[PDB]
Amino acid sequence: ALEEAPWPPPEGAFVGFVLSRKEPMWADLLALAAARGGRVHRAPEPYKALRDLKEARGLLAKDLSVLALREGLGLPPGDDPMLLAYLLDPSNTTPEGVARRYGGEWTEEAGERAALSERLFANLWGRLEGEERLLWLYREVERPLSAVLAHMEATGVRLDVAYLRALSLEVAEEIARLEAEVFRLAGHPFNLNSRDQLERVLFDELGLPAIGKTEKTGKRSTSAAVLEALREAHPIVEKILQYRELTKLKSTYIDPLPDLIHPRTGRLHTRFNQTATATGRLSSSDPNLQNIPVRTPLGQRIRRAFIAEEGWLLVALDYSQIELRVLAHLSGDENLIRVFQEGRDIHTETASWMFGVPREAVDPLMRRAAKTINFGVLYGMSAHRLSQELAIPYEEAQAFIERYFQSFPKVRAWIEKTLEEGRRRGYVETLFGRRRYVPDLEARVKSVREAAERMAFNMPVQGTAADLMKLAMVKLFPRLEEMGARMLLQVHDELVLEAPKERAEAVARLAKEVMEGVYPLAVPLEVEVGIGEDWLSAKE
DNA sequence: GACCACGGCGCC
DNA sequence: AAATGGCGCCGTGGTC
Ligand SMILES: Nc1ncnc2c1c(/C=C/CCCNC(=O)CCCCCCCCCO)cn2[C@H]1C[C@H](O)[C@@H](COP(=O)(O)OP(=O)(O)OP(=O)(O)O)O1
Ligand SMILES: [Mg+2]
Ligand SMILES: [Mg+2]
Ligand SMILES: [Mg+2]
Numbered sequence A: 001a002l003e004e005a006p007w008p009p010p011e012g013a014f015v016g017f018v019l020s021r022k023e024p025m026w027a028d029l030l031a032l033a034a035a036r037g038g039r040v041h042r043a044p045e046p047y048k049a050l051r052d053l054k055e056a057r058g059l060l061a062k063d064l065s066v067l068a069l070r071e072g073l074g075l076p077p078g079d080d081p082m083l084l085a086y087l088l089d090p091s092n093t094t095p096e097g098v099a100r101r102y103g104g105e106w107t108e109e110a111g112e113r114a115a116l117s118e119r120l121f122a123n124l125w126g127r128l129e130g131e132e133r134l135l136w137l138y139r140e141v142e143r144p145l146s147a148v149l150a151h152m153e154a155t156g157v158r159l160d161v162a163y164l165r166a167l168s169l170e171v172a173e174e175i176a177r178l179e180a181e182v183f184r185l186a187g188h189p190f191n192l193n194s195r196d197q198l199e200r201v202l203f204d205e206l207g208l209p210a211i212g213k214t215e216k217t218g219k220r221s222t223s224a225a226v227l228e229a230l231r232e233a234h235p236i237v238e239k240i241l242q243y244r245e246l247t248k249l250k251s252t253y254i255d256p257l258p259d260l261i262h263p264r265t266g267r268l269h270t271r272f273n274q275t276a277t278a279t280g281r282l283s284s285s286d287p288n289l290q291n292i293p294v295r296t297p298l299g300q301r302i303r304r305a306f307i308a309e310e311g312w313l314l315v316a317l318d319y320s321q322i323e324l325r326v327l328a329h330l331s332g333d334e335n336l337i338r339v340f341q342e343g344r345d346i347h348t349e350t351a352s353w354m355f356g357v358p359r360e361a362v363d364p365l366m367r368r369a370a371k372t373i374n375f376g377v378l379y380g381m382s383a384h385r386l387s388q389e390l391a392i393p394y395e396e397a398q399a400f401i402e403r404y405f406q407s408f409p410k411v412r413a414w415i416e417k418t419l420e421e422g423r424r425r426g427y428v429e430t431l432f433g434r435r436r437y438v439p440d441l442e443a444r445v446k447s448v449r450e451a452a453e454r455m456a457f458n459m460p461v462q463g464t465a466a467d468l469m470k471l472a473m474v475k476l477f478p479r480l481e482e483m484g485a486r487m488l489l490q491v492h493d494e495l496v497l498e499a500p501k502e503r504a505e506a507v508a509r510l511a512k513e514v515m516e517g518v519y520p521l522a523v524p525l526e527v528e529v530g531i532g533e534d535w536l537s538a539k540e
Numbered sequence B: 001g002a003c004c005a006c007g008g009c010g011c012c
Numbered sequence C: 001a002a003a004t005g006g007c008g009c010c011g012t013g014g015t016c
Helices: A046-050 A061-070 A081-088 A095-102 A110-127 A132-155 A161-186 A195-205 A224-229 A235-254 A297-303 A322-331 A334-341 A346-355 A364-378 A383-389 A394-406 A409-425 A446-482 A501-516
Strands: A003-005 A014-019 A029-036 A039-042 A271-273 A283-285 A312-319 A427-429 A435-437 A486-490 A494-500 A527-532
Touching: A014 A061, A014 A110, A029 A046, A029 A110, A039 A110, A061 A132, A081 A095, A081 A110, A081 A132, A095 A110, A132 A271, A132 A446, A132 A486, A161 A235, A161 A297, A195 A235, A224 A235, A235 A297, A312 A446, A312 A501, A322 A334, A322 A364, A322 A409, A322 A446, A334 A409, A346 A364, A364 A383, A364 A394, A383 A394, A394 A409, A409 A427, A409 A446, A427 A446, A435 A446, A446 A486, A446 A494, A446 A501, A494 A501, A501 A527
Parallel strands: A003 A039
Antiparallel strands: A014 A029, A029 A039, A271 A283, A312 A494, A312 A527, A427 A435, A486 A494
16 A cells, blocks of 8 residues: 655656557556655656656566657656566566566556555565676576567668558459359359358368368368469369459558558558567567568569668668578587688578579579578478478488488587486576476376477577577667667677668668677677668568 | 457568 | 577456
8 A cells, every 4th residue: 555645756756657558669558656755656747757767677677768759758768667577587578477576566547556566576686686697687688689689670761651551452453363263163152261261161062172180170271382282283273372462462561551651651550578488589560561572573563662761771681591601600510610710601591402503593582592591400390201301202302301410419419418407407498598487397198298308408599599689679779879870670690780871871880880790709600681672672 | 449369471 | 389598469258
């Protein structure tokens, strides 16, 4: 029972706030409160009251900071109990769960949320004293990163709306061509979007063989992998795959994105979720801008809609072979280090092998295929699936996986070391000490145990790569502000920046150097950088 | 209208 | 379909 104290709060108080909706860029600030020294200060008018705060300190601090930036207020986020809980155990992803776990209840009242922020911070800070590596990640990465993400979210990205509107109409007509052809081949119309109705057509009405079953309900699958296997069993299959591609892209990007342009900014605003993944990666939502298409011709057309403001340029930076380089460092494999000290490209070399092509003629689509193979095999792909992936007998695909691992013997050794440690202490960890708890490593069901093992030894690699990118963003942001440039998007190992046209080149050089020297490893980090008027053009 | 599980698929 | 891992969004079918 905190004393009902009057607004303003004293410096350092913990804030609580209620939004009309989860998206800070779209939300109405319904309520604002603060708690400190056994007092609760409830703001009579939330929006005006924002101006009395000098930092957003409490649960979901970034969300409030984004809203303040929207209102032209430079209110940076500070301490956030979610970030403490997430570093302790990244299964701590929601304020509902964190509260129940560390001493409170996540209600819908700013005052209670402010008092909750205060309580949880005390407890969680107590849990994190002595954990000096986690404390370092909090002070030097997550807490400062939240400020960076807040500016990214409030800045947004420009989108060629009219372009996408015109594209929709073009795609609609092609979808009609494909579905009409499907219906003719089926002999009747049906909901081609309903995979249950398609299942009957393909496997009951048509006589096509079923390849596999779905996980939870055991229906005959109609996934792309299955349809690929049936490309020649019937002409309908090809048109179903093309229908799937177009409707996926139209329904997920072409049509939704133009309606999400913010009225005040005229730009598109994602959310970068900071306590959402088991490995330390960020995620992006509402809308997700970390999964904008690129693979197919139409996907590329969609990516072209992401453009720079008039007088500016996009700068796209992407770490080269990042998790392979991270692997070299964690494992210490002398042979894998040599690969990168010699400037070799394993994705291109697998691509050249997969397609029987010299590296000069490996097109980007080939290299993408090689990356699924290379990382698929690394993190535990079966001989069987690989043989089916490469349209190749089981003997060879089985041998590719032995060649692969034989040339880097210290990898399996690191895998085995990582797993034993996880079994013993109950968690695996990144280069910087970010932890993931994987209790199923001692499961008595092999399928469950081996699944947990693949999650366990992936996490140090993926999570270290995520740590490096986070640290680079923290280092790079103030340098960009100095140059009048903007950080717009992060896509796991890629940053998209926006720079004035006359400083774009300078920004690209600087950003590349910051990313490559973020934290020297036993192998060099290389960063591919491009500049263009649109996101596609800026990645070569 | 809001949920949800599921299958499916876009990205890293 | 699958002994790669990590995400979030879509439409369907179904519930409330
Ligand atoms: N599949 C995975 N599994 C696990 N981890 C994965 C991945 C990927 C995958 C990336 C690209 C996937 C491209 N796939 C396609 O577009 C099609 C694949 C199938 C092609 C089939 C051809 C044959 C058809 C029938 O014969 C990245 N990662 C991780 C590891 C990687 O270091 C990190 C950053 O992603 P990227 O920047 O794309 O990759 P890298 O940095 O390693 O490569 P670089 O940046 O291109 O130099 O993200
Ligand atoms: Mg990369
Ligand atoms: Mg990338
Ligand atoms: Mg799912």
